[PDB]
CSV table of C-alpha atoms and ligand atoms in Angstrom, one decimal:
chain,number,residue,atom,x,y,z
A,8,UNK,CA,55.4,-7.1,25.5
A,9,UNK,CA,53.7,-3.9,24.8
A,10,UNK,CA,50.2,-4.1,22.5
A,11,UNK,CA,49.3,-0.5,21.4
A,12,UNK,CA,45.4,0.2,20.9
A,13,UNK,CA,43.8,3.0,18.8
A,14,UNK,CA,40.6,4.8,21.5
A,15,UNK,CA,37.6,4.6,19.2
A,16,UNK,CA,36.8,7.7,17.5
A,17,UNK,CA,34.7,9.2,20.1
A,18,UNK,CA,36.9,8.5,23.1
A,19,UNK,CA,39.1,10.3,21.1
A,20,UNK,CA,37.0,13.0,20.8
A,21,UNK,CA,36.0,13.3,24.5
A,22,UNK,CA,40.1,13.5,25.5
A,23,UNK,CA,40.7,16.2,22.9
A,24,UNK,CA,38.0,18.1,24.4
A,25,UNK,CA,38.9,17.7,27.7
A,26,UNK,CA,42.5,19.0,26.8
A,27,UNK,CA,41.2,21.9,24.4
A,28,UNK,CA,38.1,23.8,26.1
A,29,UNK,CA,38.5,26.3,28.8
A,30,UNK,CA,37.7,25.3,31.5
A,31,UNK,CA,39.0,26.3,35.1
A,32,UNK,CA,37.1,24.0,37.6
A,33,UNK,CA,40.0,21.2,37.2
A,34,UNK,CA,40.1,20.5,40.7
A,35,UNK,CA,37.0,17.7,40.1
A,36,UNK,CA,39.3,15.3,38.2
A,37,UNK,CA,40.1,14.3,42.0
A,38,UNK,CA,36.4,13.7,43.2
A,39,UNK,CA,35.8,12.1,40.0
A,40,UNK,CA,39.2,9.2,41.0
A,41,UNK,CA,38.4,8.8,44.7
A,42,UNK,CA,34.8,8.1,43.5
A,43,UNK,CA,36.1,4.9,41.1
A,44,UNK,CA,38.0,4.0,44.0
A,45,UNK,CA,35.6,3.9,46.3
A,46,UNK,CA,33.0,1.8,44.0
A,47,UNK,CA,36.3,0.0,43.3
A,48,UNK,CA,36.4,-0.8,47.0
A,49,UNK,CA,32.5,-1.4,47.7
A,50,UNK,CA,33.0,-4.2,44.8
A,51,UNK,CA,35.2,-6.4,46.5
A,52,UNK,CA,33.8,-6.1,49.9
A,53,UNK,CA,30.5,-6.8,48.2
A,54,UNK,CA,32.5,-9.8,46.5
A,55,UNK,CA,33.8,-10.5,50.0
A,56,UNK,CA,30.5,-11.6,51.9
A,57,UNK,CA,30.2,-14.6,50.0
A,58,UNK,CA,33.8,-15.4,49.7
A,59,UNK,CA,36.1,-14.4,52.2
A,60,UNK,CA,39.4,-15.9,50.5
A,61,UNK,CA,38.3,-13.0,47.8
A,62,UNK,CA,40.3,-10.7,50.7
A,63,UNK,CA,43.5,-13.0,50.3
A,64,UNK,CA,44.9,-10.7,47.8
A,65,UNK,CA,44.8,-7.6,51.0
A,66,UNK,CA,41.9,-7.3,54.1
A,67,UNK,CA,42.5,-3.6,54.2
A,68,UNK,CA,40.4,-1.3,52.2
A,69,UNK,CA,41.7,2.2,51.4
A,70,UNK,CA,42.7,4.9,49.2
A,71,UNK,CA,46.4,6.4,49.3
A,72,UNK,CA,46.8,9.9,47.6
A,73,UNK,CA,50.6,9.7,47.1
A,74,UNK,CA,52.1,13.4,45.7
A,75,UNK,CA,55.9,13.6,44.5
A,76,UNK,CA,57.2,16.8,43.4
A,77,UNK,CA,60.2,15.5,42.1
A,78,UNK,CA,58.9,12.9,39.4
A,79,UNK,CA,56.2,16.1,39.1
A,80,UNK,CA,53.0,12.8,39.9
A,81,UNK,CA,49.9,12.3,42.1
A,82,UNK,CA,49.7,8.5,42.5
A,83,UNK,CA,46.0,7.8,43.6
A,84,UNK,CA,45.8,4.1,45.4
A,85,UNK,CA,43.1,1.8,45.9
A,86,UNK,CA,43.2,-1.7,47.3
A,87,UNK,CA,39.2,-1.8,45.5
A,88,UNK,CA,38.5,-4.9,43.3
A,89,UNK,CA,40.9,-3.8,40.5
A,90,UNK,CA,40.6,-4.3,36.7
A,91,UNK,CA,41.3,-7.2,34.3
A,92,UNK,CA,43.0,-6.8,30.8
A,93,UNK,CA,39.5,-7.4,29.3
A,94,UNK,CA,38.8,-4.5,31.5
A,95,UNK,CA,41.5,-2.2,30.8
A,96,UNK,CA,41.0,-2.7,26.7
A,97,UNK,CA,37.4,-1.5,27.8
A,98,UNK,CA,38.5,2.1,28.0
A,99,UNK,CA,40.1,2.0,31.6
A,100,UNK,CA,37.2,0.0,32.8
A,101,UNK,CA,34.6,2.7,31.3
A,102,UNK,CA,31.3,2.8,29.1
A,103,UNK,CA,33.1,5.2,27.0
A,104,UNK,CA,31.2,4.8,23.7
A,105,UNK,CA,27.7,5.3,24.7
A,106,UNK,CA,28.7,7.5,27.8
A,107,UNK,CA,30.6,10.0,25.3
A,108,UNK,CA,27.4,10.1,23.3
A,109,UNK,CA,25.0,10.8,25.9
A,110,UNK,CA,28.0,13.7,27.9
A,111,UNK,CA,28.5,15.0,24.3
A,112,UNK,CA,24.2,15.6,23.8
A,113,UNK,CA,23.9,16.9,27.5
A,114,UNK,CA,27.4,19.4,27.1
A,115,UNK,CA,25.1,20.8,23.7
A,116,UNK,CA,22.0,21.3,25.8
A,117,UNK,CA,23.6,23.4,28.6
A,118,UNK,CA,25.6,20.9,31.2
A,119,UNK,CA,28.9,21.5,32.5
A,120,UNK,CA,32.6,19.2,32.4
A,121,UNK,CA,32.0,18.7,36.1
A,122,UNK,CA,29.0,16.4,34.9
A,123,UNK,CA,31.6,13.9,33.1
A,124,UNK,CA,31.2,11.0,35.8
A,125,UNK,CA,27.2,11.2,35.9
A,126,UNK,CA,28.5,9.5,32.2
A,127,UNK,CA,30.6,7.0,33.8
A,128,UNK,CA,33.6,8.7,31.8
A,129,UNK,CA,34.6,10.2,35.0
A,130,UNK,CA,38.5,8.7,34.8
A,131,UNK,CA,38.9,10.8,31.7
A,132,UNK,CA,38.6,14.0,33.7
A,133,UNK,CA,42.4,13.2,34.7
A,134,UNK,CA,43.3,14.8,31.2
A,135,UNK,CA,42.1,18.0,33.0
A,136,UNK,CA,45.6,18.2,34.6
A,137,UNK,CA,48.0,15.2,33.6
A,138,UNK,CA,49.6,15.1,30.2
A,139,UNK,CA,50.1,11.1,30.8
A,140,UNK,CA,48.3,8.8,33.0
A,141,UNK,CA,49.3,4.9,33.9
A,142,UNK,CA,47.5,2.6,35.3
A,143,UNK,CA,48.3,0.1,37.3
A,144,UNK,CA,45.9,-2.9,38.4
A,145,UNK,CA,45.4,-6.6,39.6
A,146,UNK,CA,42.3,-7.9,39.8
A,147,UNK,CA,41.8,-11.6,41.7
A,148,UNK,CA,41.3,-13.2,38.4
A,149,UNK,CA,44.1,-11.9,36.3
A,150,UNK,CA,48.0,-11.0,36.3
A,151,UNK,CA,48.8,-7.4,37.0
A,152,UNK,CA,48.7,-4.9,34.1
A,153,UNK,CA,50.1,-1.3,33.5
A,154,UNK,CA,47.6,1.0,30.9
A,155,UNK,CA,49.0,4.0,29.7
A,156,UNK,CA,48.0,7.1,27.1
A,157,UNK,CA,49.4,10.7,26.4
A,158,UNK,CA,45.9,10.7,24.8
A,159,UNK,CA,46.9,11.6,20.7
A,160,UNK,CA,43.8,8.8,20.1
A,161,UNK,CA,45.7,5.6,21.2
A,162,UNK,CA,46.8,3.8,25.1
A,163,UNK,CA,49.2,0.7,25.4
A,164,UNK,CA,48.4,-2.1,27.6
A,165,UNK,CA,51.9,-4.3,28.9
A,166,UNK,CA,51.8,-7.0,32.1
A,167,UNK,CA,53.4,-5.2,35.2
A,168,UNK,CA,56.7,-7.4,35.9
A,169,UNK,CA,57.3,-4.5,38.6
A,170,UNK,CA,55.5,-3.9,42.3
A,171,UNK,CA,53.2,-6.6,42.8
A,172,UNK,CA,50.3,-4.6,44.4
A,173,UNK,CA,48.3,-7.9,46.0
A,174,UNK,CA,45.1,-6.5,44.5
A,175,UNK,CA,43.7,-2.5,43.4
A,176,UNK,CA,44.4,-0.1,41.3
A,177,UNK,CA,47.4,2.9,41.2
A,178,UNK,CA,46.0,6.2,38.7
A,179,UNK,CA,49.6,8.0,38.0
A,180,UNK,CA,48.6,11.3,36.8
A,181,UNK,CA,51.8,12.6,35.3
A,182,UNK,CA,51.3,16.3,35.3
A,183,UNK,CA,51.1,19.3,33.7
A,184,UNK,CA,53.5,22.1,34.1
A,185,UNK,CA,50.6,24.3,34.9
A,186,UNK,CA,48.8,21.9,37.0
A,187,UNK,CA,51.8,21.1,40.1
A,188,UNK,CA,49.3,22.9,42.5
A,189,UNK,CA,47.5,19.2,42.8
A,190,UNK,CA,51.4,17.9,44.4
A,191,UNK,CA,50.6,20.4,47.4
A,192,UNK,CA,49.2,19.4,50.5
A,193,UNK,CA,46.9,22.1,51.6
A,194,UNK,CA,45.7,22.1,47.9
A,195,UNK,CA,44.9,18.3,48.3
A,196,UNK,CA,43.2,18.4,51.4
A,197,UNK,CA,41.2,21.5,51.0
A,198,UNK,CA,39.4,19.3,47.5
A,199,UNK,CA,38.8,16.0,49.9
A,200,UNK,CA,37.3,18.1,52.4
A,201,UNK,CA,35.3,20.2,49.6
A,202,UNK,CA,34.2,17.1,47.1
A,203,UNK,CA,34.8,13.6,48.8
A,204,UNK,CA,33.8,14.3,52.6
A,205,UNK,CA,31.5,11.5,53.3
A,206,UNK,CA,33.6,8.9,51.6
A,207,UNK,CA,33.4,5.2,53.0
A,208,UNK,CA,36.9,4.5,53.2
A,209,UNK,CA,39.8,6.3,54.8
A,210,UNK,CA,41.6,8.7,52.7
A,211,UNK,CA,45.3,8.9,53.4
A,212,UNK,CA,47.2,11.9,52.1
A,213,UNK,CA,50.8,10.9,52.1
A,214,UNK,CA,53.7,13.4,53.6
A,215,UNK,CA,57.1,14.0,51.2
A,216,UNK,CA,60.4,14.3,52.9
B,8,UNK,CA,4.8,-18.7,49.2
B,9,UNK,CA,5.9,-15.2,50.8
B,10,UNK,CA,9.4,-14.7,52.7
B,11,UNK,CA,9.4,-12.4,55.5
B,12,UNK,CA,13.1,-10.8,56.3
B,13,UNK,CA,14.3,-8.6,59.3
B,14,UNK,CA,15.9,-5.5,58.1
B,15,UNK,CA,19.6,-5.3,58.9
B,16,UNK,CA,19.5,-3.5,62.6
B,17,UNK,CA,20.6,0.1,61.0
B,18,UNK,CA,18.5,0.4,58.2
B,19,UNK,CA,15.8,-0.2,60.2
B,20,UNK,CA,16.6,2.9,62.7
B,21,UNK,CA,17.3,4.6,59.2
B,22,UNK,CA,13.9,3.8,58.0
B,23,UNK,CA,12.2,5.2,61.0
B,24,UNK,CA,14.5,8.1,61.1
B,25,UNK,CA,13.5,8.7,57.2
B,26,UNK,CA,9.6,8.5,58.3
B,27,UNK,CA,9.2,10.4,61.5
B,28,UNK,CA,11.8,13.2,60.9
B,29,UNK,CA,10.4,16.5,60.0
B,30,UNK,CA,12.0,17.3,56.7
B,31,UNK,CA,10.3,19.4,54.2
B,32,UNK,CA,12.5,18.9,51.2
B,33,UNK,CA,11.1,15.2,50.3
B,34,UNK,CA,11.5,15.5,46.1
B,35,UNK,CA,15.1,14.5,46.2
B,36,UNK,CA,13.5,10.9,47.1
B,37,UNK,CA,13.3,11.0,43.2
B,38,UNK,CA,17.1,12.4,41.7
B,39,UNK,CA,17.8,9.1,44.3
B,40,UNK,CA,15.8,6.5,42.6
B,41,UNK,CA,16.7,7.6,38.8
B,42,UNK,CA,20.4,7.4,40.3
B,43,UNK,CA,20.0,4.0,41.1
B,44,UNK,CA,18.5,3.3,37.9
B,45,UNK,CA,21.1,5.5,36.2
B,46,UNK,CA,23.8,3.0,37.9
B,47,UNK,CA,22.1,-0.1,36.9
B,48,UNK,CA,21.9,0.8,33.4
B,49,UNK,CA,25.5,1.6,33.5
B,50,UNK,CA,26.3,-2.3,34.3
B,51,UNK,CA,24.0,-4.0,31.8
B,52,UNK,CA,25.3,-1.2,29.0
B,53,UNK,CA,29.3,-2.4,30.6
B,54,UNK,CA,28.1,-5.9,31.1
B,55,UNK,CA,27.0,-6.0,26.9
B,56,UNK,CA,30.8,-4.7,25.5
B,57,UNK,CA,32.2,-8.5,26.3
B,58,UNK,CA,28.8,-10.2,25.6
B,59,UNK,CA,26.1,-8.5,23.1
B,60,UNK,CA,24.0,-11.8,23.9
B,61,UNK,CA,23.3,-10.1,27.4
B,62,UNK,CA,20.7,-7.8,25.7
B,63,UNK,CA,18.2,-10.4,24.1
B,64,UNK,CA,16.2,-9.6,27.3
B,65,UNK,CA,15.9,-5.9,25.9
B,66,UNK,CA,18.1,-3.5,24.0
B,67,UNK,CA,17.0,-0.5,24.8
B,68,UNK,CA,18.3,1.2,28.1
B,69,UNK,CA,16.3,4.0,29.2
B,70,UNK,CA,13.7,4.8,32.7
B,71,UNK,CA,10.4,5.7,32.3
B,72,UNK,CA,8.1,7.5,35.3
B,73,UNK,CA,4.3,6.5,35.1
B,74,UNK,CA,2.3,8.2,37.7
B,75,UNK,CA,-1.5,6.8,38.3
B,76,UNK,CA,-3.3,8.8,40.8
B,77,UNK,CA,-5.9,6.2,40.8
B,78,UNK,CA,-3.8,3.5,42.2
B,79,UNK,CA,-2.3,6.7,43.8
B,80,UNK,CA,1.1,5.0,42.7
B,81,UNK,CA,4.1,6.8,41.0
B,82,UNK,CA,6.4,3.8,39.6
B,83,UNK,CA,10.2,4.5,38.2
B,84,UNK,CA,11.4,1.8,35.8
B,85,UNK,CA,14.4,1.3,34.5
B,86,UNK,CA,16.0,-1.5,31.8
B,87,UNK,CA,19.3,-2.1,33.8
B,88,UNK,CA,20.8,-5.4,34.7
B,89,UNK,CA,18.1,-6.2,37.4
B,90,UNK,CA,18.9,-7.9,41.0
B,91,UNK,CA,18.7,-11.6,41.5
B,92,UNK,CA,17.0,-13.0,44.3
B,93,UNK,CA,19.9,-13.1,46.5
B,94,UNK,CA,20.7,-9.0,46.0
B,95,UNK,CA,17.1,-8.2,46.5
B,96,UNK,CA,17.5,-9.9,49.8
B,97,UNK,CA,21.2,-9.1,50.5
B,98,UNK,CA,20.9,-5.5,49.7
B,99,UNK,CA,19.0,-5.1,53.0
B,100,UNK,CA,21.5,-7.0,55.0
B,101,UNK,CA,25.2,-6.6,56.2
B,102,UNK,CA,26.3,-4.7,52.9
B,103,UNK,CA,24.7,-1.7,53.8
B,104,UNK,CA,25.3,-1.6,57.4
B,105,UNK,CA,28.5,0.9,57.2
B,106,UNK,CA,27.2,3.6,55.2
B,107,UNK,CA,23.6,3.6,57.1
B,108,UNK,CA,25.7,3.7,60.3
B,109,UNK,CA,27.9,6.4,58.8
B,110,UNK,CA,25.0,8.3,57.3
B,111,UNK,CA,23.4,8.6,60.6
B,112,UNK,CA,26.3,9.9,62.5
B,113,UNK,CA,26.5,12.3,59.6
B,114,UNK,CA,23.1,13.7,60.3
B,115,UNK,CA,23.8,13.8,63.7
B,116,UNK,CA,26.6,16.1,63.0
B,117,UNK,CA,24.8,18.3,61.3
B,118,UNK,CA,24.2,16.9,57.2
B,119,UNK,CA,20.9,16.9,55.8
B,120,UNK,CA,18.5,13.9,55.0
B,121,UNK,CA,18.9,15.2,50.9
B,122,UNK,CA,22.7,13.6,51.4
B,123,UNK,CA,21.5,10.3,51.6
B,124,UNK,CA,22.9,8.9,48.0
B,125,UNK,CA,26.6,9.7,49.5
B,126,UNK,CA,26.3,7.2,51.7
B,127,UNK,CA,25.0,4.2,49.1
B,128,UNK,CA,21.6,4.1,50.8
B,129,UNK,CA,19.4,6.8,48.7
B,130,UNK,CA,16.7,4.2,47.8
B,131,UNK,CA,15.0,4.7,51.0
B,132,UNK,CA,14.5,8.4,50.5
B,133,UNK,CA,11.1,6.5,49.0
B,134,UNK,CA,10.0,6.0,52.4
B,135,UNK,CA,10.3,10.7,52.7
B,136,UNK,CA,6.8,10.0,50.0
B,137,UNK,CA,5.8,6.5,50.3
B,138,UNK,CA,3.6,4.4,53.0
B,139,UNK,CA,4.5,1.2,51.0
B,140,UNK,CA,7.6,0.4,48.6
B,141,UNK,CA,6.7,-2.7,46.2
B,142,UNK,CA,10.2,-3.4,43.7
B,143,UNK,CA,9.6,-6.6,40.7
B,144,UNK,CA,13.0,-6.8,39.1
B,145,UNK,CA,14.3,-9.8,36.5
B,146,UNK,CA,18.0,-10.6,36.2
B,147,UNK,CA,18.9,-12.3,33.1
B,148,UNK,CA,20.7,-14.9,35.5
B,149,UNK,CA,17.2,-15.3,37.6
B,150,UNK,CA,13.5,-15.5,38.0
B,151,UNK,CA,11.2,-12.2,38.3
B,152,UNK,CA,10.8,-11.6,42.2
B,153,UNK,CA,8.4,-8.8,44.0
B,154,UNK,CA,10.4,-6.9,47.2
B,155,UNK,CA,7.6,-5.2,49.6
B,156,UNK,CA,7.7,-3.5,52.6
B,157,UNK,CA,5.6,-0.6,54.5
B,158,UNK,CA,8.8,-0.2,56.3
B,159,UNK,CA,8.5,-1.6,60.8
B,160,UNK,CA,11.5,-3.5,60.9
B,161,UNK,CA,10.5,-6.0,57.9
B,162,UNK,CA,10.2,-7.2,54.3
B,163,UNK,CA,9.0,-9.3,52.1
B,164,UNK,CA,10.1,-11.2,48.9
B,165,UNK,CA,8.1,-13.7,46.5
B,166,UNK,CA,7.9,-14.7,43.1
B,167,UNK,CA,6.3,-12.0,40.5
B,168,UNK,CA,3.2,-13.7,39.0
B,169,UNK,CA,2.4,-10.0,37.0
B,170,UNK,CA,4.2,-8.5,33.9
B,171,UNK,CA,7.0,-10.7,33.0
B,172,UNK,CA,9.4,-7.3,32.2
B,173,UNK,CA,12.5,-8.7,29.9
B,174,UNK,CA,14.6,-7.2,31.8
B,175,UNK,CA,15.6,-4.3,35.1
B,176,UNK,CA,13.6,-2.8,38.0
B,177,UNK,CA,10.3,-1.6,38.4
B,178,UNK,CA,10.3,0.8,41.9
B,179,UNK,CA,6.3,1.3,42.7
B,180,UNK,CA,5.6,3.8,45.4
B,181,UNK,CA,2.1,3.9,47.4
B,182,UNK,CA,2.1,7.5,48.1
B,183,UNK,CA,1.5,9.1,51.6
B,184,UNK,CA,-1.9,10.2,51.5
B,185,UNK,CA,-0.7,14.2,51.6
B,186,UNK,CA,2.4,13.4,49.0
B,187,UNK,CA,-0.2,12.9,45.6
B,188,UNK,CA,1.8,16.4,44.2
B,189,UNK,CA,4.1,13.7,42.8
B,190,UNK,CA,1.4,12.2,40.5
B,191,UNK,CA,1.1,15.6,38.9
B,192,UNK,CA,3.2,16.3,35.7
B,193,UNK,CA,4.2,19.6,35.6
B,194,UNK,CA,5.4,18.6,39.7
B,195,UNK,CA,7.8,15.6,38.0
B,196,UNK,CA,8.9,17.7,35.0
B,197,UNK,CA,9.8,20.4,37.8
B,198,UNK,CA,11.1,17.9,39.5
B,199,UNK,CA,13.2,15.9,37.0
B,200,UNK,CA,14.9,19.4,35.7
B,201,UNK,CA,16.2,21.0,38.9
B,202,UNK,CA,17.8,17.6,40.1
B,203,UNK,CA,18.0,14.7,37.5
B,204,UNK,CA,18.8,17.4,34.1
B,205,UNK,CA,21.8,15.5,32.6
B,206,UNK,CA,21.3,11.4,33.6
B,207,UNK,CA,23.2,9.2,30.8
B,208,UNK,CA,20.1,7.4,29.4
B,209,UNK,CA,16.3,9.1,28.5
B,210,UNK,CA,13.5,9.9,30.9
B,211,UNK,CA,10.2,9.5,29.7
B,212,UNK,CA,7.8,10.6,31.9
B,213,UNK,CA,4.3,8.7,30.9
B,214,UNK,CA,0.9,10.8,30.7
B,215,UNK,CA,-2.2,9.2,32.6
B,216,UNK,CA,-4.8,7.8,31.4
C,301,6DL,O1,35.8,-1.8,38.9
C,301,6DL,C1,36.9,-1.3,39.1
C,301,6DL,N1,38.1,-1.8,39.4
C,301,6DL,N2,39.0,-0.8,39.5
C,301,6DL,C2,38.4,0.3,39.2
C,301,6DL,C3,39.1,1.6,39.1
C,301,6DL,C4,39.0,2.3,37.9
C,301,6DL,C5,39.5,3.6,37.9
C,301,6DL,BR1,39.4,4.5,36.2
C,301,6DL,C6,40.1,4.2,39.0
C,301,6DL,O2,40.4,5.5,38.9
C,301,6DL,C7,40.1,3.6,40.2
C,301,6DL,C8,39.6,2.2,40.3
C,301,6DL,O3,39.7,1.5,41.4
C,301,6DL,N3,37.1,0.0,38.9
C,301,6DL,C9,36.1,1.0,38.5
C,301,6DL,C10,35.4,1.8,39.4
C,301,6DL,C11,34.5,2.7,39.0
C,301,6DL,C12,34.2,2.8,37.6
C,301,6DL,C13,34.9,2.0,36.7
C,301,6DL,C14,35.8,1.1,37.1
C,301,6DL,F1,36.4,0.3,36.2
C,302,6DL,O1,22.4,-3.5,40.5
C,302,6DL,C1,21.3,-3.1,40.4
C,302,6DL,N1,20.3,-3.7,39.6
C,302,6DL,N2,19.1,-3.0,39.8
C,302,6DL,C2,19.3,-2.1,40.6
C,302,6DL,C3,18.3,-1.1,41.1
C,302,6DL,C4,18.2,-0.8,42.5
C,302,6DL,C5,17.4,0.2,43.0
C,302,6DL,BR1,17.3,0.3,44.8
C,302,6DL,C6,16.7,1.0,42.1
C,302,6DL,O2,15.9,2.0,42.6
C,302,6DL,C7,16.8,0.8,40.7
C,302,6DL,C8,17.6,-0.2,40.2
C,302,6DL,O3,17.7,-0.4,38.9
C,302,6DL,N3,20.7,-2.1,41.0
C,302,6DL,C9,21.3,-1.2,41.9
C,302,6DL,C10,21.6,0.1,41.5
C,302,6DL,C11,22.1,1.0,42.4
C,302,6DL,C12,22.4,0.6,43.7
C,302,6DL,C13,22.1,-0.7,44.1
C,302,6DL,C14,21.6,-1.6,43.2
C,302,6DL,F1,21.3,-2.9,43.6
């Protein structure tokens, strides 16, 4: 049922630097997840001009930020292409071995954390503010599949009996104590409007209560 | 044989708005071409994890910029995964009709021409330097084909009889009479530092002669 995976060792060392430095710009771990999702979504309408039935799975393309204070998460929603398990064991769908190399070499020469998804490593920046992040994702071509990691250098991978989701991928960022400013509305929509304005697909910031 | 295409209907307004709009900042037309490279590289790097055997066309990802001021050409080439003939084509079609559409609204709501790349159409920030944009490319599941097009509403696609280059995209722009700055070196060093410091793979920029 669940298969536990160790993160190679310089995954590893990208997550426990992205928990340990200082660092107070952690409001870009948002850009950096709208940003997947919206190449997410531009795959499958891509997919979708030579295949229609590829839209079977869902026709409407979007991202859903989803706050809840009382399970102390921010859900972020796509309905983009999604991942497949081959994927998922990929680091998250990342080029996290040769990306950590290259973000490690530019951090030494001068760049800043907000550079991480210039790396494509950007989903890591979610260890900025969530001490636990699931995945959730179904890609046309395979079941649906729930990744998850507390980071402490491994993640588990398990098939998602739950929610079918027809086709996307749900980023549960499972918060900090410090960090429940990203469950607030006005925080939310003041980083949309600041770092993912001219996105191609509608953002919907979801209401509680 | 030679193909002639139409442009899809908004890229072509975006092509003449590119050309005949005064805009004084025309250097990001290169942080928008090593970003496309930058991306490419990413999928032939992703594209390797599940199949090494993808990389017998060329192991080594990097870009190189070669500037020839007696061809008056500055080309940008990369080692990514390359476009088959049907992208080359495609690219310029339906795909691309949202964010052009929604990248022109932008600027008529006040954006600037240098945010482009946020709307998935930064490679024809070319056309801010270039009277003619020539790009070869070789897919590993295709033939090497030559894009052309001195913008008007058209372009043109045929086989590449030149270089056979392994593997990626080779971008070749015939500079604007008044734009040969950007065939100088200490201009592209400039250039490459202020906007394009911390790209995942290595720039080399080639020395004439
Ligand atoms: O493809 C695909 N599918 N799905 C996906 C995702 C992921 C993530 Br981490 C997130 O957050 C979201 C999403 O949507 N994708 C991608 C994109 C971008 C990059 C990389 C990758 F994997
Ligand atoms: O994919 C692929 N392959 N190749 C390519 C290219 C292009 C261009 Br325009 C340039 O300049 C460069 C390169 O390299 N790609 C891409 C990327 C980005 C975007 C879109 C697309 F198509």
């Amino acid at each position: 049922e669940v298969e536990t995976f160790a993160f190679q060792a310089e995954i590893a060392q990208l997550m426990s630097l992205i928990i340990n430095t200082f660092y107070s710009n952690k409001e870009i771990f948002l850009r950096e997840l709208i940003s997947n999702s919206s190449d997410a979504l531009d795959k499958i309408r891509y997919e979708s001009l030579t295949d229609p039935s590829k839209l079977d799975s869902g026709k409407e393309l979007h991202i859903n930020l989803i706050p809840n204070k009382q399970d102390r998460t921010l859900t972020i929603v796509d309905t983009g292409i999604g991942m497949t398990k081959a994927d998922l064991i990929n680091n998250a769908g990342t080029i996290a071995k040769s990306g950590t190399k290259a973000f490690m070499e530019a951090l030494q020469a001068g760049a800043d954390i907000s550079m991480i998804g210039q790396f494509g490593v950007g989903f890591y920046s979610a260890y900025l503010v969530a001490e636990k992040v699931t995945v959730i994702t179904k890609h046309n071509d395979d079941e649906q599949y729930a990744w998850e990691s507390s980071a402490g250098g491994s993640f588990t991978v398990r098939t998602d009996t739950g929610e079918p989701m027809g086709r996307g991928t749900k980023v549960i960022l499972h918060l900090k104590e410090d960090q429940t400013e990203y469950l607030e509305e006005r925080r939310i929509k003041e980083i949309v409007k600041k770092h993912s304005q001219f996105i191609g697909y509608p953002i919907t910031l979801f209401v509680e209560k």
